[PDB]
Each structure stands twice: as C-alpha cells, then as structure tokens.
Amino acid sequence: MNFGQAIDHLRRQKHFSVKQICGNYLSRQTYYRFVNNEVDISSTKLFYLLNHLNVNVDEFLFICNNFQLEKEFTDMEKIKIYFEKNNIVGLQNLLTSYSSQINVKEKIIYALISSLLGRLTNTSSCTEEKILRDYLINIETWTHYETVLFNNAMFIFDSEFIELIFRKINLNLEKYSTLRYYGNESIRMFINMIILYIDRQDIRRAKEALQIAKNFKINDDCMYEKSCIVFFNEVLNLLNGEISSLKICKSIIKYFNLIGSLSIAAMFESYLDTLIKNNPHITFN
Amino acid sequence: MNFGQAIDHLRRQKHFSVKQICGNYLSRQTYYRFVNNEVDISSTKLFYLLNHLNVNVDEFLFICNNFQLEKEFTDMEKIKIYFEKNNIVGLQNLLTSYSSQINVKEKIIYALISSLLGRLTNTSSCTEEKILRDYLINIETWTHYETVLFNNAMFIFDSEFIELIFRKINLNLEKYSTLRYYGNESIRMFINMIILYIDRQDIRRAKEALQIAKNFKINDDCMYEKSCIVFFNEVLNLLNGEISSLKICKSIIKYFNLIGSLSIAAMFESYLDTLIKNNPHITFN
C-alpha cells in the first residue's frame, strides 16, 4: 500500500482534518495528489505529516507493508531456521530469489545462503565467505542489519574474527542502549557468541565476552536478557567447577516454566543436559 | 543534525560508495547538495538511501536527534515521574513550554499537564480533561502515542471510560503484536489498567482485563510481560481467597532479585505488602 493511502487511512482512523495534519506546510491539492499516488512529497514533509498523525515512522512502514516486517529481515529469520533444520530446499529456494544480486543487500544474503549451503554439502564457497568477511570487518557504525547478519553468519568464522568483531562493536552497541528491540538484540548476539565459544571449548573468550555483556547498561525490565547473562555466567562458573551454580541454572529454568516460556525453558533444559554430557566434571559429586 | 549529514556519516562508517547507495535513483550533484542541506529529497528516495545503507528509519531518526528519543515521548516520561513524586514545579515548567499550543500534539500534552496539576492542587481542569477524553474516544487506529498518553492519563478517568477504551483497542493492539517494543508496551498498559482496577476495588473489570491480556499472543522471550500476567492473575486468585497463590507471587519476586532486577523486585515487594495490608483476608491462615 503506497504512502498516500496509509497517511489518509491513519488520518481518518484518528478523526484528524487535512488542515490539522498539513498545517501550513502542504496544500490540499498537493495532499490529495499524494493520497492518489500522483505526486511524491519531500522527506521533511512526510515526517511532518507522521508527526501531526502522532504516528512513528517504524509503525507507519509496518502498515504500508501490509502489517509485515521488511522482506530482508523476514528472509534472514527463514535462513536461520532452514540452516538449523538442515533444509537445503528452503536455502536453495532463497538462493534463486537473491541470485539477481542487483545491490549490496542481495550480495550479502546471496553470500550468506551460499556459505550456509557450503557447510551443509561440504563444498567450498571461498568467494562468498570473503564477501561476508569484508562487509562485516569494515563496519564502524554497527546497525540492526549487521546484528541479524552476524547472528546468522557467526559460526562459519574462525574465533579470532568473531573476537575481532565483538571487541570492535562494544562502543556504538552501547550508544543505542536506549534503542527499543536493538539494545536487546545486541545482547542476544553476545549470548550467541558466548554459546559458540563455550561450544568450541574456547572458554577463555566466553569469560571476556560475558564480562563485557555484564558491563552493558541493562534496564531491569530486560528479563530474558538479564536471565541469559546470569544463566551463562553460572554455566562458566560450573566449567571452573562449582555444583553450587547448577541449582541457580535449574531455578532459572523453573522460572521460565512458571511464566509459560515453556519452549525457552526446554531449550535451556536441553542445553544444560548437553553441557553436563560433554563436560561431566560439572555435576561430579 | 540534518538528514544529509546523517546519511553520509552512515555511508562512510559502513565504507559504502555514493554509487552503491544512490544507485540510478539519485545524481552525485543531487546527493551532494542534499548532504550540505541545500536541497531536500522525495520520501521514496530517502527510504531508498536508508535501504541501501542497510539502516532502519527508526535507527536513522535516533541518530539525527543526537542519540535521543523524540522530545514528546521524553516529555511524557518526565510528566509520569513528576506526577508520581508530586513535583508541581516540573509539571508547571512543562506547562509553560507547551502553553504555545501550536498543534494538536501541544494541546494534548498541555491538557495532560493541566489535568495532572488539577489533581495535585484540587482545582477544576474541566476544559482540559474534555480535550483528552474526546481525543482518546475517537481513536480507531491506536498507536504508541495514545498508549504513552493513556498510561499517563488513565487514572483521571472514570472506570466506564477506561473499560470503553480497553474493549475498543483489543483488535488493532493485536495487529502489531509482531511490533517491537509496541506489542510489549500495549501489555504494560493492560497491567496498569488491572493495577488501577484492583486499586479501585473494581475486581470485576480487572478479571475481564487480565483474561484479555492472557489471550494476547505473547512471545516466550517477553518475560517481564509474561511475569506481570502470572503475578497479577495470582493476585486476583488471592483476592478470591487462596494462600496457595501467595507462594507463586513471592517466587516471581525472588526471581527478579536473582537476575538483578532489584528495583522491579522491590516495586512488586512493596505492592504485595500494600495488597495484604488493604485486604488482610489474603494471608488469613
């Protein structure tokens, strides 16, 4: 649905007048033609209109795309799942649709799908891993896109590279602490790094990664994140030998189950069972 | 900082080329003058540029405003605090800055500050409560703005009005369930309603409000919200007589304390102490 329709739909749903929203920045003729998709409007005049509608741009865009997040971000979660479940078919299908590679955006995801398919078919995707590596290593302002991309690409990279990326994003990651669903998505990626380091028996960089995640300024309502911080800290303690930390891991699992986070309680249940299995000294007496 | 500078700062921080971002939709001369704030650009061409920067508009705007949420939303949290703490001075100061009332936005917050000052000085603000009531009652697309406004205005309104608003927003509130920090802010307002109904000894509409909040589709990572749902449900059970529900309320408090949500654990601690004090039958044996 084009911007003209969405603005007018929001204007009528909030019982506003064209004058109330257009003020003395836009004409009725200018406003009408915009509604019918005859004319575009300067960006400062769109934000003016949204400002007077009392509507945020992210809310706006999420209506213009028929109540759906943007295709790149939704394709990125599909990619995540298809690789988890060894779904070569979904991966191969997403590879076809991005094979166009019209812009940088289509090259990164192309390279991401090829590189994950390479891992599933034990084939070289030397070119495509290089595209990904070069894009990520030259990010000095790290946004949501790179965070989504990095949660998804992380495990194809050697630990020196992951450490490089982690050390090099601390700063900006902090700046948007006040950002909604971004500050929190930054933390979740740090947990993914800790998980991946713990899983690679590279405990030394997991300790350094967690201590950084603790120093991140975390609002007391960010309870999934604060839970992850605590859980994984006790999991590090366990690996340094303390069965006192196993009760704390179990109690965090019980509390997920108490509040009906049953699917997440089971993921942590499976992880702590998988952790005791691979390092049996944790539980020893 | 104007849009031109922000785009170019993001472009250089991500080591992109003017051609990579401008593609064949914008000229170098057009792009440069935009950077120097000589020319604006059509809204579809700004979103094009942000799309190629791999940056979301909300992220973008949060950089253009020097890493700060928009003044209206930050003024709204200040208003919340100043009313909690009986700070007539901050309220009176915010009233001065909006006394301009240039647009709808400045009229709503003006009316909100006057109405909260009226409650603190036991004076009539009959005109201003009417402005607020009329704005809220005619919202068929309920956005974040109205949610922030309503958390803040809620308690000046009779319970029939609050029920009216609650029944009338279920639908749209659901649509943006997938929305980040919005779906979740919708739930928190529902808890505020439940709190306010429980506090007005109007248990009957608290039961109806909670049952609706339970039917809301809540992702398992939304743990502060799922915790609130569970806590307040057991608090309703308590009020219908079951000391079995008091252990569950205490365990949810203990888990906030375990994960370092110490300020939120104390708020719930104080509330359950204040709840037992006003309805002593809860604990009875």
Numbering used by the authors:
A (entry chain A), B (entry chain A): 1 to 285
Quote the study that presented this structure, word for word.
The expression of sar-BGC is controlled by a divergently transcribed quorum-sensing system that is composed of a leaderless communication peptide (LCP), NRPS-inducing peptide (NIP), and its cognate cytosolic receptor, NRPS regulator (NrpR). NIP is expressed during high bacterial population density, secreted, reimported into the cytosol, and recognized by NrpR, which leads to upregulation of sar-BGC. During environmental acidification, SAL cytosol is acidified, which is sensed by a pH-sensitive histidine switch in the cytosolic transcription regulator, NrpR. The protonation of histidine during cytosolic acidification promotes high-affinity interactions between NrpR and its cognate intercellular signaling peptide, NIP, which leads to upregulation of sar-BGC expression.
To elucidate the molecular mechanism of pH sensing by NrpR, we determined the crystal structure of cytosolic receptor NrpR (amino acids 1–285) to 2.6 Å resolution, the first full-length structure of an LCP receptor. The crystal belonged to the I21 space group, and each asymmetric unit has an NrpR dimer. The overall architecture of NrpR is similar to the DNA-binding members of the RRNPPA family of regulators. Each NrpR subunit is composed of 17 α-helices and has two distinct functional domains: an amino-terminal DNA-binding domain (helices α1–α4) with a classical helix-turn-helix (HTH) DNA-binding motif and a C-terminal helical domain (CTD) (helices α6–α17) that has the characteristic tetratricopeptide repeat (TPR) motif-containing domain. The two domains are connected by a linker helix α5. The TPR motifs form a super-helical structure in the CTD with an exposed concave surface. The putative NIP-binding pocket of NrpR is lined by the helices α6, α10, α12, α14, and α15. Contrary to this, the side chain of H144 is located at the bottom of the predicted NIP-binding pocket of NrpR and positioned to influence NrpR-NIP interactions in response to pH alterations. Since NrpR was crystallized under neutral pH conditions, the crystal structure failed to divulge the pH-dependent allosteric changes in NrpR that lead to transcription activation of sar-BGC.
